[PDB]
Design a protein around this motif. Structure first.
Motif, PDB file in Angstrom:
ATOM      1  N   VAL C 441       0.858  -1.170  -0.014  1.00 26.19           N
ATOM      2  CA  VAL C 441       0.061   0.028   0.063  1.00 26.19           C
ATOM      3  C   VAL C 441       0.876   1.113  -0.129  1.00 26.19           C
ATOM      4  O   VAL C 441       0.549   2.275  -0.605  1.00 26.19           O
ATOM      5  CB  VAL C 441      -1.158   0.031   1.219  1.00 26.19           C
ATOM      6  CG1 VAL C 441      -1.586   1.305   1.426  1.00 26.19           C
ATOM      7  CG2 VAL C 441      -2.181  -0.966   0.929  1.00 26.19           C
ATOM      8  N   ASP C 442       1.903   1.191   0.595  1.00 26.02           N
ATOM      9  CA  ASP C 442       2.870   2.477   0.882  1.00 26.02           C
ATOM     10  C   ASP C 442       3.449   2.893  -0.506  1.00 26.02           C
ATOM     11  O   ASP C 442       3.215   4.095  -0.900  1.00 26.02           O
ATOM     12  CB  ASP C 442       3.809   2.129   1.749  1.00 26.02           C
ATOM     13  CG  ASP C 442       4.599   3.352   2.192  1.00 26.02           C
ATOM     14  OD1 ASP C 442       5.433   3.859   1.337  1.00 26.02           O
ATOM     15  OD2 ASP C 442       4.417   3.904   3.373  1.00 26.02           O
ATOM     16  N   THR C 443       3.929   1.945  -1.315  1.00 20.90           N
ATOM     17  CA  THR C 443       4.458   2.126  -2.594  1.00 20.90           C
ATOM     18  C   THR C 443       3.404   2.477  -3.678  1.00 20.90           C
ATOM     19  O   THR C 443       3.625   3.235  -4.305  1.00 20.90           O
ATOM     20  CB  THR C 443       5.282   1.119  -3.160  1.00 20.90           C
ATOM     21  OG1 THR C 443       5.952   1.586  -4.478  1.00 20.90           O
ATOM     22  CG2 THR C 443       4.722  -0.326  -3.108  1.00 20.90           C
ATOM     23  N   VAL C 444       2.335   1.825  -3.557  1.00 20.97           N
ATOM     24  CA  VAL C 444       1.135   1.952  -4.343  1.00 20.97           C
ATOM     25  C   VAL C 444       0.361   3.421  -4.332  1.00 20.97           C
ATOM     26  O   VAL C 444       0.061   3.903  -5.172  1.00 20.97           O
ATOM     27  CB  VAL C 444       0.324   0.857  -4.579  1.00 20.97           C
ATOM     28  CG1 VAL C 444      -0.929   1.176  -3.429  1.00 20.97           C
ATOM     29  CG2 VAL C 444      -0.564   0.635  -5.704  1.00 20.97           C
ATOM     30  N   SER C 445       0.326   3.858  -2.989  1.00 20.58           N
ATOM     31  CA  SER C 445      -0.131   5.128  -2.783  1.00 20.58           C
ATOM     32  C   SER C 445       1.115   6.184  -2.803  1.00 20.58           C
ATOM     33  O   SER C 445       0.605   7.367  -2.841  1.00 20.58           O
ATOM     34  CB  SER C 445      -0.841   5.108  -1.345  1.00 20.58           C
ATOM     35  OG  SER C 445      -2.289   4.686  -1.815  1.00 20.58           O
TER      36      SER C 445
END
Ligand SMILES: [Zn+2]
Ligand SMILES: [Zn+2]
Ligand SMILES: [Zn+2]
Lengths: 78, 104, 585, 187, 187
Positions: C441-445
């Motif tokens: 989630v961190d990298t995708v957001s």
RNA sequence: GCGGUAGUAGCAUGCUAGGGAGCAG
RNA sequence: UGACUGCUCCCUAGCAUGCUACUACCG
């Protein structure tokens, strides 16, 4: 008047019934042709309004084929 | 059913009860037992012997109603055919109309 | 044959003859489309051709209409007027014509191969109906080119699992079996039922999806129907409703979700909404929520495939009654679990393929990615609902743009549903960080979905990372990667619980060959619809062009729950990503 | 009429020969001018008759076209139209039997055969719901097609012979309601 | 008109007359200015009224000769269709049972009405009602035309397969009655 | 001053062909 | 699937004749 409006609704009722492939059951097309040829030769509007119930009931017993609800809510008899 | 013509006629005082003019000519429908039932009306043709001494005189009074005409055989280039687009019979209605056989 | 020139909104009766779809052009489009672009042919209630024994001059060029027919110049019964004259073409509606200021629409799109970047970018700045026609011409060009391909056949029946297949000779033949080959068979002169076959491996090894009976000479070729015209737009103007009047709200409210009553009131006072949702972002459990909270609401549920419907139907019958769903089956992979041949219900599910049009009240579909505007238009014309809640993501599993010749366009410039959002702004707040972990989630957001999801759950320090460049070695028709699969296998042996995963790969032949000595089930990459599992082995290649071009598989990373394995050979997606780095032995 | 390219000859020569009698001149000049008027007048009464025939000819080909296009939309829509015609005509008749079997077969009570006209005349209809049964039939008497029948057997979905005493807004929610009621005509 | 062999004279006479208008022309040269394009123009119109007749004549044989070709191509497609029939209705003559009656014939001529009656393999019986059925085709075998035939199939008017047990005395009201029995020869 | 001759345009008649439609035995 | 004949109305293309004006040579 009233005997000429029944004699023209039984010509449109055996054309709706001929476009639904009721010609493919030669035990019921032989009754519909006899209820339509008999209405056209009638000489009273009390013995031609009772062969129009038998002939019309063939269309209302054919289920899915004719959408009765749509066809009655189409600016017609409600 | 031509409903526009019937509506127009009714709106002009036609087809009233007890009128001199009624509808009596229709299109009648038939079931699948119609062709054979019409063919079977050939049972009315029975063998018939005639009175020959009387027929041999009638045939001579009858060929006097046909004395003012002329007749004979004509070549294939004098024959007049109208509407060459009409059937050509059994063994052939499978391949064309009378035009195909009058051209071939 | 009286259609409509929607290049002008003009009602006409002509159409370009030697053209892609033969569409309706007015007297002012079909005037200039013919002179510059060589479409010297128009089609009317009767074709514009000569009408005299043997003639072969069929060009509505200077053809003269006389004697109730279209004669020609070369042999001249002229005594008439030309068909093309005074900035117009002859035909009905010759007076009620409007004209177009964009002359070079056909001049640019009716000659090209329907794959150039310029055509697409000028398409995404058109109106809704012109772009609907552009999407129908894309489907039509795909189907037109569908009959310019090869055909398979079998003339000799051999023992099972060892057959031979020849496709064709001397013509330009790769195809990611995506839609599989179901042709029909022949024995002597008629058609014989054969079934559907799948060719993945390949004397030539043959697998079997289902038992069949091979015959001599059986052919295989695909026939595809033509997409019919539709009569409904794709998007709708923004218009907030008066109130939430006309609904039947429920006294009970969920308590495990802290963002449920707010979004319920929002959809109550909002008409249409679009979001950018990765897998597991409300598609899993919020549909049941709106189902129970809004009982009388006629909610229609559909996916692009029955397998994403299965994801909700598996648990949709435990908490809720079985009869709450209804799908029709034709007589594509499915299964006859539900009550079929019942198109009457309150929560009537739906299918992209076919479904009768009765009634609807709420728009909620699953992933709508693997298609152009066609899907939005077919679902808006099939049923017109009062409210629109578009679940999913426009760029999640995009449809492959047939033949690529000029790179790949930037996601920002999609058909209709991606640039509007990032030019006006998000409408609704929604997120389900229950299944997905934070490491993804961190990298995708961080990349595209800035400030949309929060790092709820921690990481168990399990993600695998090892920078390996490797050596690539291509051949005349394929290529096999030695280093990376080997090091992956060597890393897998270091953990005891690693033999309960699947075998998924970008290429079907690679994993199929590699499974013959490991013993893992065959799997491929078309769409991981509603199918989330813990363990997985991910791969790519050919990166450079097929794999390492854009973030085609960023959302697709979210299938796991406590960690995933995704090696990469570049330095653009690890600048701040914190996959555990380790060195090779 | 006007706008024709050959029109600036029947204007100059028409104006000239015209004014020419006020100023006047020899007969030679007059004859010369008239033999230019007629020379460039035929050119007008020839290009404004060919057009006169093309302008009406055009409005005929573009009328056969209107006929070949309405007569192909009149034939491709036959089904949809004769069903509308029939029901526009069935309302105008205002019969009682015809307006009963039509309203009944709109809520659900369609027949399963032809409506017989005899005196035994067995019938089979399908009552879908309790209200339709309550309105139509009460007791052993059934009203249909403006006639009275006597119920002889009631049957639920498979073969469940319902007794007339156990169908009453009560025991009723416990059965498969598409019934198949059999009746015989009266007199 | 650019190749008519009378364009040279016309062109030159026009140039001589028309182009020489500005130059002072006396009343004697004016005759040449007038009676030189005249006569030449008449001849040119004569050379154009014959060309227009030759063209039409020509374009009445390049249309009447496509029609002589069309018909011969067609004459070869029917001549090859009757041939493909009279050679397919021939490979069907059990030439053991047919050369056995043309041989017992006095001269080799036989009536045609006895060829299907004595040399055929299949029999088709069309039956109207049940009473006719039990006097013509009872059981699985029956005798007709001094032979013995064994029933093989019983289709009906609708062309649906009937079995020899649906044909009762009381199930008869439930069949499309023109019944077609197909039987094969025995021994 | 008039007549004849050969093209061109324009208006009706009859005949020969093609096409669509109506009636009768 | 659509027979043989006869009559008759309407539309288009071609051929010849019938009163005129235009041309041009010829009287
Ligand atoms: Zn075109
Ligand atoms: Zn236009
Ligand atoms: Zn031509």
């Amino acid at each position: 008047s009233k005997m000429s409006d029944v004699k023209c609704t039984s010509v449109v009722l055996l054309s709706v019934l001929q476009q639904l492939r009721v010609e493919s059951s030669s035990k019921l097309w032989a009754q519909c042709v006899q209820l339509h040829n008999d209405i056209l030769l009638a000489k009273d509007t009390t013995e031609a309004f009772e062969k129009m119930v038998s002939l019309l009931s063939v269309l209302l017993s054919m289920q899915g084929a004719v959408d009765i609800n749509k066809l009655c809510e189409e600016m017609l008899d409600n | 059913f031509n409903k526009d013509f019937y509506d127009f006629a009714v709106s002009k005082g036609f087809f009233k009860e007890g009128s001199s003019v009624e509808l009596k000519h229709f299109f009648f429908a038939q079931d699948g037992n119609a062709a054979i039932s019409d063919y079977d009306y050939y049972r009315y043709n029975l063998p018939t012997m005639c009175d020959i001494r009387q027929l041999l005189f009638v045939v001579e009074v009858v060929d006097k109603y046909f004395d003012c005409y002329d007749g004979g055989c004509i070549n294939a280039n004098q024959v007049i055919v109208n509407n060459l687009d009409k059937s050509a019979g059994f063994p052939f209605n499978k391949w064309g109309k009378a035009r195909l056989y009058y051209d071939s | 044959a009286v259609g409509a020139c929607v290049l002008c909104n003009s009602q006409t009766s002509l159409r370009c003859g030697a053209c892609i779809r033969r569409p309706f052009l007015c007297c002012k489009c079909c005037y200039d489309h013919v002179i510059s672009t060589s479409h010297k042919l128009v089609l009317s209630v009767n074709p514009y051709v000569c009408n005299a024994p043997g003639c072969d001059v069929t060009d509505v060029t200077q053809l003269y209409l006389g004697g109730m027919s279209y004669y020609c110049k070369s042999h001249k019964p002229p005594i008439s007027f030309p068909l093309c004259a005074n900035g117009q073409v002859f035909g009905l509606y010759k007076n009620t014509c409007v004209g177009s200021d964009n002359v070079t629409d056909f001049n640019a799109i009716a000659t090209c191969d329907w794959t150039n970047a310029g055509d697409y970018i000028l398409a995404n700045t058109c109106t809704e109906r012109l772009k609907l026609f552009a999407a129908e011409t894309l489907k039509a060009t795909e189907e037109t080119f569908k009959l310019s391909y090869g055909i398979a056949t079998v003339r000799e029946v051999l023992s099972d699992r060892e057959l031979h297949l020849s496709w064709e000779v001397g013509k330009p033949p790769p195809l990611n079996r995506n839609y599989v080959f179901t042709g029909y068979r022949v024995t002597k002169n008629s058609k014989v039922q054969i079934g559907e076959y799948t060719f993945e491996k390949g004397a030539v090894v043959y697998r079997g999806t289902t038992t069949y009976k091979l015959n001599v000479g059986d052919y295989f070729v695909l026939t595809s129907h033509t997409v019919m015209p539709l009569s409904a737009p794709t998007l709708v103007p923004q218009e907030h409703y008066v109130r939430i009047t006309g609904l039947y709200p429920t006294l009970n409210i969920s308590d495990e979700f802290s963002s449920n009553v707010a979004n319920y009131q929002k959809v109550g006072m909002q008409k249409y909404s679009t979001l950018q949702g990765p897998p597991g972002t409300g598609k899993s459990h919020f549909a049941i929520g709106l189902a129970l909270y809004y009982p009388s609401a006629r909610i229609v549920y559909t996916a692009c495939s029955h397998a994403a419907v299965d994801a909700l139907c598996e648990k949709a019958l435990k908490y809720l009654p079985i009869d709450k769903c209804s799908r029709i089956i034709p007589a594509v992979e499915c299964f006859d679990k539900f009550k079929v041949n019942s198109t009457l219900e309150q929560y009537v599910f739906c299918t992209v393929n076919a479904l009768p049009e009765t009634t609807a009240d709420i728009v909620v579909f699953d992933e709508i990615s693997m298609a152009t505007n066609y899907d939005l238009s077919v679902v808006n014309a099939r049923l017109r609902a009062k409210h629109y809640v578009y679940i999913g993501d426009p760029a999640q599993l995009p449809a492959p743009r047939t033949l690529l010749t000029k790179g790949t366009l930037e996601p920002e410039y999609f058909n209709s549903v991606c640039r509007l959002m990032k030019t006006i702004g998000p409408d609704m707040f929604l997120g389900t960080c229950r299944r997905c972990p934070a490491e993804i989630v961190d990298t995708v957001s961080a990349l595209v979905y800035d400030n949309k999801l929060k790092a709820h759950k921690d990481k168990s320090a399990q993600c695998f990372k090892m920078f390996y460049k490797g050596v690539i070695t291509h051949d005349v028709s394929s290529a096999i990667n030695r280093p990376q699969i080997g090091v992956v296998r060597e890393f897998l042996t270091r953990n005891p619980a690693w033999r309960k995963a699947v075998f998924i790969s970008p290429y079907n032949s690679q994993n199929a060959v590699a499974s013959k000595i490991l013993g893992l089930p065959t799997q491929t990459v078309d769409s991981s619809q509603g199918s989330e599992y813990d363990y997985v082995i991910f791969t790519q290649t050919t990166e450079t062009a097929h794999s390492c071009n854009v973030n085609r598989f960023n959302v697709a990373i979210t299938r796991a729950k406590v960690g995933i394995l995704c090696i990469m050979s570049d330095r653009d997606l690890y600048d701040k990503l914190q996959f555990t780095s380790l060195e090779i032995p | 009429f006007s706008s024709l390219p050959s029109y600036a000859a029947f204007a100059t020569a028409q104006e000239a020969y015209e004014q020419a009698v006020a100023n006047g001149d020899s007969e030679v000049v007059l004859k010369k001018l008239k033999k230019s008027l007629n020379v460039a007048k035929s050119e007008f009464d020839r290009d404004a008759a060919m057009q006169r025939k093309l302008e009406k000819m055009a409005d005929q080909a573009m009328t056969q076209m209107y006929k070949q296009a309405r007569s192909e939309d009149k034939r491709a829509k036959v089904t949809s139209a004769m069903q509308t015609m029939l029901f526009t005509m069935l309302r105008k008749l205002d019969n009682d039997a015809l307006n009963n079997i039509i309203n009944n077969a709109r809520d659900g009570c369609v027949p399963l055969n032809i409506i017989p006209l005899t005196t035994a005349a067995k019938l089979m209809v399908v009552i879908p719901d309790y209200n339709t049964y309550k309105n139509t039939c009460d007791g052993t008497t059934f009203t249909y097609a403006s006639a009275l029948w006597e119920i002889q057997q009631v049957v639920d979905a498979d073969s469940k012979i319902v007794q007339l005493s156990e169908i009453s807004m009560d025991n009723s929610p416990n059965l498969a309601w598409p019934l198949i009621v059999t009746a015989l005509r009266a007199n």
